[PDB]
Assembly symmetry: C3
Amino acid sequence: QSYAAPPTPWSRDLAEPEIAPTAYVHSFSNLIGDVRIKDYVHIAPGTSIRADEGTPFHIGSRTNIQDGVVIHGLQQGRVIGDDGQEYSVWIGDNVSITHMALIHGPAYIGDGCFIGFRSTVFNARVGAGCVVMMHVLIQDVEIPPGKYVPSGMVITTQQQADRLPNVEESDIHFAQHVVGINEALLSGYQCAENIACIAPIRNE
Amino acid sequence: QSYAAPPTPWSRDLAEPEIAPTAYVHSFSNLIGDVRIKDYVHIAPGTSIRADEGTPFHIGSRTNIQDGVVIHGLQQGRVIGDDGQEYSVWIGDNVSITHMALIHGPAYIGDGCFIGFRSTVFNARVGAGCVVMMHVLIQDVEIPPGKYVPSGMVITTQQQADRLPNVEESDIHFAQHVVGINEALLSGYQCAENIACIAPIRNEL
Amino acid sequence: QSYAAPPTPWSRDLAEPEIAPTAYVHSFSNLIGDVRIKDYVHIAPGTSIRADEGTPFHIGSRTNIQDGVVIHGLQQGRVIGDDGQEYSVWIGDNVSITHMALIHGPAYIGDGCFIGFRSTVFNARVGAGCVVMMHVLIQDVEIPPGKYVPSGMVITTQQQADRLPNVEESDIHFAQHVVGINEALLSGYQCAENIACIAPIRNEL
Ligand SMILES: [Cl-]
Ligand SMILES: [Zn+2]
Ligand SMILES: [Zn+2]
Ligand SMILES: [Zn+2]
C-alpha cells in the first residue's frame, strides 16, 4: 500500500517509494512519498511511513521496521546521509527499529543500531552501534557511537547523552541476532508468495 | 472505512460519523459511531477513533489527528462542550493531536492546544493554549489555560497540575506552524484524489 | 486479514489462527500464525498479533484486546499455560489488554488481569487478578497474584516486583466492569451482522 507525495508549496515531484525487490513489506501498512528502501528490509504490519513534510527518507540494507512503527519528519531540518545528500530521516544498514518505535526527522541512526520497544528518536543523531532499550525518549541530542541506554530514560540534554556507558559484547550479539531473525522472516514471507517454493513445503 | 455505532444496553441510534467535505481522512484508518468532524480537519494513517462506549466525540475546525492516534471514551462521564452539549470527548479548534497520542473520554482539550508525541489525556481538562510535550501522561486533573508540560511528566494529582509554567512565545509559534502545515497537507491529498487537479501536475514531471 | 506463519528454519507448519465463532474481530487488524482465540473475545481496530517467531499464542474466553495493541514473541523461551501446554504468549480468561498495550513473549498473564493504557509485559509472568495501570513497563520479573501497579512505574528487577501493594476490592470491580463492557460491545457488533437482530432496531430510526 504505497502512494505518491501530495503536491504542496514545498513539494511537487509526486515522488513514490523505491522498494528493493529483495525487501518484503506487509500488506497492512501505509507508505507515502520519497522513501528509499534498500535490499533485504522487513517492514511489519501496522506501520505508517510518511514522507510528505520532511523528505527524503533512507532505510538501509538488512534493516527491519517492526509493528506499529511511525516515521515522519519536520518540513525544515535535514541530516547528511553517508552519500553526501540531505535526508529528513536516515536509518543505516543492519538496524532494528522495534515494536511501536517512533523515528522523527531530522534524525540519523547509524549502522547496527538497536532501537527498543516503544522508544522515540526525534531531532537527534544516534551513533553507529548503539543499543537503546525500552520506553526511551531521545530528543535534541547526539548519542556517541557504541553506547547503551537503559530502559525508561528520558534524554533531552547533551549533558545526559555524554554520560552513557559503552555497549557490552552480549549487547552486540543480541543486536545481530534480531537482524538475522528478520532476514529469515523476510525470506519465508517471500517463499509463501511463490507457488514453486511454498507448494513442496505445504505438501509435507 | 466509516461505520455506525453498534446497538448496546446504553445506545440504539446506530450513529455514523459526520465528516465535513473540506476534511481529509486517510484510507488506512478506522472511524466508528457519533464522531463529528468539522472543517479542514486532517486524519492521518493508522488512527482509530471509536465512539461505541462513550459518545459523542467532537473534533474542531483546523485540527489535525496524526499517525497511530487512538480516541475512545468511558461509557459514564461527560464534559460540557462550547455549544452547551455533553460529550465523551471534546477537542477544540486549531489543535494538534500528534503521533501516537491517546485522548480518552471524559476529556476536554481547549482551542489551540499542542499534544506531543506518545502523550495521553484521560479523565481530564486541558485549558486553551496549552503546549504538552513528549511521552506525557495527564490523568484525573485540570491543567489551567496557557501552560507548558515538559517531556516525560506523569501528572496524576491536582497538586502537580497547579505548579506548571506558562507557555513561552516560541512555544506558541511552534504550535501554530504545525496547524498550518497540516492544513496544507489536506488540500494536497484532496488534489491527488481529483483527476482534474493532479493530472496537469504529473504532466509537468 | 488472517495469515499463515511463514516457512522458516524453526517452523515449517504454516499455521493459521483458530478463531471461536462467538468472537468478534474488527476488519482493520492483522493476525498471523498459530493464534488460538477462544469464546467471546473482542479484538479492536489497529491491532497486530503476529506468531511467526515465538509461537503458539493463547487468548482466553471473555478477554478483550483493545485498539493499537501489538503481540509478538521471542523465538526461544516459553511459559506453561493452565492447560499444561507450552506458549510464547498465554493470556487467560476475563482479561483486559487495553489501548496500545504491548505483550511480548515469553509472557504469561493470568485470569482476571487488567493491563492499562500504553503498558508493556515482556519476558515476565503476571499473576491472576493483577491491576496494572497506565504507562507501565514490566520486564524480566514475576509479579505475584492479586497485586496493584501505579501508573508510570518502570519495573525491571524482582526487588521492585516483590514490594507491590495488594489490589483493593474497588480495583476488582473496576476490572470486571471493563470485561462486561467489552462483552456487550461484542454482541452488538455481531447483532449488526445478523439481519434478524438489526432489522427491528434500524426500523425504529
Ligand atoms: Cl505507544
Ligand atoms: Zn510529525
Ligand atoms: Zn477505552
Ligand atoms: Zn519481537
